[PDB]
RNA sequence: UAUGACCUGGGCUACACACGUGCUACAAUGGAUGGUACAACGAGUCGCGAGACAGUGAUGUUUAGCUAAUCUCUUAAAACCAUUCUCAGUUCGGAUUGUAGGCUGCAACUCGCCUACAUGAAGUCGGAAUCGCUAGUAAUCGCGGAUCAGCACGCCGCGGUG
């Protein structure tokens, strides 16, 4: 990767400034993403959502799987069903194969007022995010984006520290 | 990894040129491809030459939107 | 515009109330008024024909006439519109 | 970037491929049609290779398309209550020419 | 009313913006030939007779 | 001593909604490309107002000519070839808007415009039906008066095509 090295060496000061000093192997650290359609919407055919699964294979984190709702909504009659909106559930050095999109491509492409999401307080050092359309990822996105069916973006630190998580993402790439 | 990933990572013969900063592997887009350009499957220019500061919230701080605001709605000598 | 247009007697109340006191209403008349940047921070009346409307001014009030200071074009309004 | 790289069509001139875009048009898109030296161009399904790279900031003279959105927004949403003789008519919805709204202007007026 | 609408525009008002002209028999509103200083409606009352080289039988 | 008035602006034109009501579109005969050729075309040296001009145009900057069988109007459009958009909510379609300017007048929202520009909604040929159209007739394109400081698709006449 590249942000392994600039991560650790650039947080060695922010080790001491933020909470833990001397826990030099185990400091706060990111965990993963999850990237989902989650639209609902399956009751029409579920097949348009089964092109949203090719939208998730198109953004190409990993294998685009789907979830079953626990109860099937009377207002949506969907009979629990497996297609609901897509799932990755992407983690690790693949995240480190994924974040340079986030910091130097994705929202600096979509140019929407530095994407402020300070509302994203997940209690303990995690941070949500969403998106409407994705004109992101050149030569992959286009000729099927007649409607981007959506995606959601949730980062998560190992730490329970929300503001140090703000300094952990906002350490690099995205102000809020 | 899965074994034999029948999902994507498929190599389009292109380049993730500059300040996306990626090259090519079993990989398909964005932040994934590789870290070098000094052999060049294709050469790193086709996307962009300006960085995340290509975002116009900060592009030399991006105060070229200024001036605006106080000539709204009256600093004038008519009427 | 070129060759501007402006009030006269309540221009002499711009110059009779800017110096003295920013307080009172006026038995106004104006289809011929403006607003200067000095004018902001005072109270003036608007001649509908019965109610000399006591409106103070904010900098938003760019140099329009008292025919359009406040919508004193009386039309009731909240009955069957749009 | 991207501004000129946003949502390429084929088959057109860049001028209609920018009135196509929210904003830059027949004064200015023809002005930078010439300033980038484009001139119909495309009808090609290729814009150029590098007159893009001219027309990044050569196109970026309009401040901005997102601040055309925030220019209508930043303009009128301050311009709410000057009167509000005009703002109430504009945002209640009638075309505020001072326009005769008796019968017609039926769509924006609302049937 | 015949004098606030005949005599009044005879009295000097502000301008042509205010004192719009008409014929001097009855101060009738516009549709007034200012090229011949007389109303259409009042000049028609002459055009019972007519002192004009125009053909009289409503061409 | 009042339904008679002087002034002052706001109404008079305001809008949930029906018919009166024409133009504009939906499109390739269009829409850009240009350079035509025409009747008109009446007020006027009171006023119209050059190839003198900043121009995106309003208008200045000059007003030449102008008591008209002078002159600015009066060089109208289609047919003309030139390129493409030859297919689509369409170089669209022009609802606004936000303006940024000029003209008019003492003043442009009520209670005139016009010139940009940016966004450019409907609208993809029109229920029931109606009305008009047997000659330059429908259709069609222009000019002037018309009112008037300002301001006219329908508002008078005349003719250009057919």
- CA of B28, C1' of F123: distance in angstroms: 44
Task: Show Cβ contacts of residue A81 under 8 Å, excluding neighbours closer than 6 positions.
Answer: A42, A46, A68, A69, A72
Q: How do beta strands A155-157 and C43-44 pair?
A: unpaired
Q: Which of B49, B65, B73 sits opposite D63 (nearest CB)?
A: B65
Give the span between the Cα atoms of A136 and A130, in whole angstroms: 14
Q: Find, among A144, A138, A61, the residue nearest to B54 by Cα.
A: A138
Chain mean position to CA A28: 19
- Strand F interface, E 27-56, C-beta < 7 A: 30-35
Check the annotation: does E29 bind a ligand. no
- Annotated ligand binding at E12? The verdict is no
Helix (H) or strand (E) holding D72: helix D66-76
Chains C and A touch (3+ CB pairs under 8 A): no
Q: How was this structure determined?
A: cryo-EM
* Residues of A (55-114) whose Cβ lies below 8 Å from D: 109, 111-113
Instruction: Give the tokens for residue A95.
Output: 């995240």
Helices (H), chain A: 3-17, 49-59, 99-104, 106-110, 162-169
Distance CA D13, CA A111 (A): 25
* Cα distance between residue A103 and residue B31, in whole Å: 10
Using CA atoms, how far apart are residues D21 and D7, in angstroms rounded to an integer? 8
Pick from D102, D72, D101, D100: which is nearest to D87 by CA?
A: D72
Residue of B14, B20, B10 lying closest to B42 (CA atoms):
B14
Residue–nucleotide distance: E36 CA to F116 C1' (Å): 40
Query: Token pair for residue A50?
Result: 């089964």
Residue with tokens 């061409």: E59
| Cα separation values, E58 from E47, E50, E52, Å | 10, 12, 13
Distance, CA of B49 to CA of D97 (rounded, Å): 47
Cβ contact, residue pair C59, B74, below 8 Å: yes
Verify whether the Cβ–Cβ distance D1 to B50 is below 8 Å. Answer: yes
CA distance A21 to A12: 9
Contact (CB, 8 A) for A134 and A148? yes
Q: Please tell me whether any atom of strand F lies within 7 Å of the Cβ of C37.
A: no
Q: Of C68, C81, C82, which has the smallest distance from its Cβ to D83's Cβ?
A: C68
CA distance A89 to A153: 10
């Amino acid at each position: 990767n590249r942000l392994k090295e600039k991560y650790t060496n650039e947080v060695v000061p922010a080790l001491t400034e933020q909470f833990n000093y001397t826990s030099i192997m185990a400091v706060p650290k990111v965990d993963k993403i999850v990237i989902n359609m989650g639209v609902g919407d399956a009751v029409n055919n579920s097949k348009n959502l089964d092109k949203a699964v090719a939208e998730l294979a198109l953004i190409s984190g990993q294998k685009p799987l789907i979830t079953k709702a626990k109860k099937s909504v009377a207002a949506f009659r969907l009979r629990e069903g497996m297609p609901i909106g897509a799932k990755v559930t992407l983690r690790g050095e693949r995240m480190f194969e994924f974040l340079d999109k986030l910091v130097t491509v994705s929202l600096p492409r979509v140019r929407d007022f530095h994407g402020v999401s300070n509302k994203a307080f997940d209690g303990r050092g995690n941070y949500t995010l969403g998106v409407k359309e994705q004109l992101i990822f050149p030569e992959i996105n286009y000729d099927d984006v007649d409607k981007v069916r959506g995606m959601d973006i949730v980062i998560v630190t190992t730490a329970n520290t929300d503001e140090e998580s703000r300094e952990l993402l906002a350490k690099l790439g995205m102000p809020f | 990894m899965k074994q034999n990933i029948h999902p994507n990572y498929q190599p389009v013969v292109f380049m993730d040129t500059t300040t996306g900063y990626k090259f090519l592997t079993g990989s398909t887009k964005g932040s994934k491809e590789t870290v070098e350009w000094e052999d060049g499957n294709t050469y790193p220019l086709i996307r962009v030459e300006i960085s995340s500061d290509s975002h116009p919230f900060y592009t030399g701080r991006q105060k070229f939107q200024a001036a605006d605001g106080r000539i709204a709605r009256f600093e004038k000598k008519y009427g | 515009k070129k060759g501007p247009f402006v009030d006269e007697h309540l221009m002499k109340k711009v110059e009779a109330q800017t110096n003295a006191e920013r307080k009172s209403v006026i038995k106004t008349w104006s289809r011929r008024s403006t607003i200067f940047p000095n004018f902001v921070g005072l109270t003036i009346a608007v001649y509908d024909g019965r109610k000399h409307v006591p409106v103070y001014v904010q900098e938003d009030m760019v140099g329009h006439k008292l025919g359009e200071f406040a919508p004193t074009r009386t039309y009731r309004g909240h009955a069957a519109d749009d | 970037a991207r501004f000129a790289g946003v949502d390429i069509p084929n088959e057109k001139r860049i001028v209609i491929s920018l009135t196509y875009v929210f904003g830059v048009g027949l004064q200015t898109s023809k002005k930078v049609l010439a300033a980038a030296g484009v001139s119909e161009d495309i009808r090609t399904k290729d814009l150029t290779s590098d007159q893009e790279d001219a027309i990044r900031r050569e196109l970026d003279g309009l401040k901005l398309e997102g601040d055309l959105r925030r220019e209508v927004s930043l303009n009128i949403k301050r311009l709410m209550e000057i009167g509000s003789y005009r703002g109430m008519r504009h945002r209640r919805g009638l075309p505020t020419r001072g326009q005769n709204t008796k019968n017609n202007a039926r769509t924006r007026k609302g049937p | 009313a015949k004098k606030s609408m005949v005599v009044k525009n005879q009295r000097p008002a502000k301008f042509s913006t205010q004192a719009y002209t008409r014929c001097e028999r009855c101060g009738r509103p516009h549709s007034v030939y200012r090229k011949f200083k007389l109303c259409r409606i009042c000049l028609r009352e002459l055009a019972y007779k007519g002192q004009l080289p125009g053909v009289k039988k409503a061409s």
